[PDB]
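Rotation project, supervised by the postdoc (A.L.). Task for the rotation student: set up a whole-complex structure prediction and record inputs and outputs verbatim in this book. Inputs entered:
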Amino acid sequence: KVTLPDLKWDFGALEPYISGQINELHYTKHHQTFVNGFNTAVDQFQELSDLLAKEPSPANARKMIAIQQNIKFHGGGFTNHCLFWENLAPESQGGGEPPTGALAKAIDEQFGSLDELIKLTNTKLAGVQGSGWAFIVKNLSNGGKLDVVQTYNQDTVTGPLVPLVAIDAWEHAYYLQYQNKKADYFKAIWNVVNWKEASRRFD
Amino acid sequence: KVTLPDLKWDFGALEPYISGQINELHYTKHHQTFVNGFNTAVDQFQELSDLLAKEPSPANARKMIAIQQNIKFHGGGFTNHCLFWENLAPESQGGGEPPTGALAKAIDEQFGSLDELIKLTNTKLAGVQGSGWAFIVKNLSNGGKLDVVQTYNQDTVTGPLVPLVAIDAWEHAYYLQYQNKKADYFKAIWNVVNWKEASRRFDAGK
Amino acid sequence: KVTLPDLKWDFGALEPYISGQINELHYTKHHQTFVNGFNTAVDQFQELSDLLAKEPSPANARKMIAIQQNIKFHGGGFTNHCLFWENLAPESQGGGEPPTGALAKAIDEQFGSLDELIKLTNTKLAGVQGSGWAFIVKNLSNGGKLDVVQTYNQDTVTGPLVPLVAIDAWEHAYYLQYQNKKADYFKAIWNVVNWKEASRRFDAG
Amino acid sequence: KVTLPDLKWDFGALEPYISGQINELHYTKHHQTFVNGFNTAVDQFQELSDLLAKEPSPANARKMIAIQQNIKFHGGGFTNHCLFWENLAPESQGGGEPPTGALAKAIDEQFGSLDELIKLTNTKLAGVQGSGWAFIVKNLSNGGKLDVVQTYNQDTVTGPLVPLVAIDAWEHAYYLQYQNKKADYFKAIWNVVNWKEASRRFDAGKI
Ligand SMILES: [Mn+2]
Ligand SMILES: [Mn+2]
Ligand SMILES: [Mn+2]
Ligand SMILES: [Mn+2]
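Outputs recorded:
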């Protein structure tokens, strides 16, 4: 049974970049809905699993196939929002302060500067043509190299792709404050990105 | 724990339309690989389910998201092939004979002939731009109306769409015999399609 | 060069079901963005097509492939929003009024009633796990039968699937008013659905 | 108008790793079908582009949307197979020989050896659940780093992802010889992979 994570900060602590009103809806409604949905999907799985254990028919297997989609969507929503709240911080807690050490060295070697990496990430975020996410990741299969990937809907990065920074590009992440001006939101969010958490995930 | 279904015919019973060589590989290698993969994926999800119970973190949830792709692909392969073997028959068991009853009535009402429906399905099969399936389905949500749908890979039709005829368009279903001439296989398979089974599925709504 | 269509009503004409603030953004910002994007994508096709004619290399073919996504997305945005505005109307213009004729008869035959069809469509809209659309369509390949289909992003219905009603399930279509309660928006929109335009599409299809 | 490229080797030159029967069908039937399809899709799109120029309706835009799927699939099939033939060579033409220069340096930096890069690529290939490809790529957006990506069907790597080695995982690429034993084919193909072409692509930063 999963639960909404505690937040490290108050709803309004990321203003003016992300409003408190968005945070409260995003956290208490959207995220909570993925929590509930994920729990329901795993219960339904459990039941189907027992059922198939005693009656391993094609019909029952098809029934499981049906639930897989909800496990993926709600699991993805749950995990992605947990990641998101953890890589956000108010400036008083280090939000927007550039990373140090190994991550900073890697960013410098690959992208030239933090500014370049961020510019690339915002171009990726703008390029999500639908609902989705952008992730700065460490690829453990190619020598631990940084990349920026896009996912759609609540798809997430798994296995050898370690998420370092997750940025939400669903319209509900910004619409009440920015409406259609999503570029302004993509630009503004970096002032409250927690690069300390990014460095921790990198380690 | 699922297993390969019993076949209603021997591997060579669909000759010359589908070779015995193909049927033997298709059943004993491909379908068996789906059976194994589905069993493994389901077991792994049980394991991760307990792990998530003990420690309901985003990391463990992430792992479950990883396993669902395998449950979907292998589950889909298992179930789709089961449907497939059940809607094929040799001519001695009614393969290639036209459907009966309400299904035939539906086909006449919607397509005007069985030939129109088969032509539509073959066009759908040719249109699968990859590995996939075509299904003739009964749509339970729109008053039980017949339609033809494509899926890719091992995706299947679920919910309100009841598969009546599954046709496999993965290359392994025909390559040894027809090679690149997939149109010839799509054309030839209708001689061994079991419309008796299709009628049954139509009438049952499952 | 495609352009925004003229709306048959002012932005605030669908209240209280759809805010005028929403319609104004949805039309002037979002849809316009699809118009501009589609024009850009078609011109880029022209350019790459000449490029490919002069040098039909794998590299240039690879560029062609690259533009296809924008063609699909912006083309879809343009088309879908045109359909959308055309099947909405204020109640004063017959919004929410039930369909007549052949469409009405087919609906009764297939779904039992207009209410059952609307419920099915709302279930499909709720089922869009992401941004997307639902369409009520006439299927020309199976004898002209009605169906409800979902699409994601700006994917649309083509070929034998004639769109009769399109409903937008992207958050920008409802968020400023309904926020997370998308089900309330899905339920409310039918009060301004133009079923006469649906009937005309059905007969012409 | 695209055309079937010239091969740099005879159909039976990659035996016993890939049969002559396979290469002949793969080239003269499958790839040719992509050539024909891509030319036809491009023609049809030009036609609809003209019609749209005179009649900019949502209906015509819907027809355009329908065509672009064919442009994607056939364009992909065409490009992916051109890549494929160019990164294959018989052993006497240097197939199976390790890459040199900048590519070799990058490979040893990120993977330690060609060994592990090939192992990674084989796991990716086995992981294609349907028809598709694996590509060893140079990512131009992250400082030029190597990676291995999967695509399904005739999807291809575009933009910052530059294909260095393309391996075909469609069943027609191996079934006549290996049937269901796809891992045997993925293992065997490396004996006739042309790393000199891969190095040329890495150095050039494009195909
Ligand atoms: Mn969100
Ligand atoms: Mn099969
Ligand atoms: Mn919209
Ligand atoms: Mn191929």
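Student's summary: The radius of gyration of chain B is 19 Å.
Supervisor addendum: The interface with chain A takes residues 1-3, 5, 38, 42, 45-46, 49, 52-53, 56, 58, 61-66, 68-69, 71-72, 75-76, 78-79, 82-83, 156, 158-159, 206 of chain B (CB under 8 Å).
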